[PDB]
């Protein structure tokens, strides 16, 4: 029972540290997505501001 | 368990810093076509202002 107990826990972190580690940095990911698109949508009508 | 474990962070993680580098750069690529597109528009009708 033990055995297979830490086979399931292990087997079921693994499909969730990868979701989980993907999230992290699909998260920073857009985090600077935002910094950046940001600085396009920013501009763009600042020329067309003017 | 902990060794498909950290298999699975890895593996998502690998999906997902894919589309978060992208995502970076796809971004900072926006932020300057914002500071160029503006300058398109901004003198477009500056002329056409004329």
Chains 1, 2 share one sequence.
């Not at 910094?35 to 600042?46: D, F, H, N």
């Amino acid at each position: 029972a033990m055995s297979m107990a830490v086979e399931s826990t292990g087997n079921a972190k693994a499909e969730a540290e990868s979701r989980a580690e993907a999230a992290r940095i699909e998260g920073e990911g857009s985090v600077l997505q935002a910094k950046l698109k940001a600085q396009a949508l920013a501009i763009e009508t600042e020329a067309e501001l003017e």
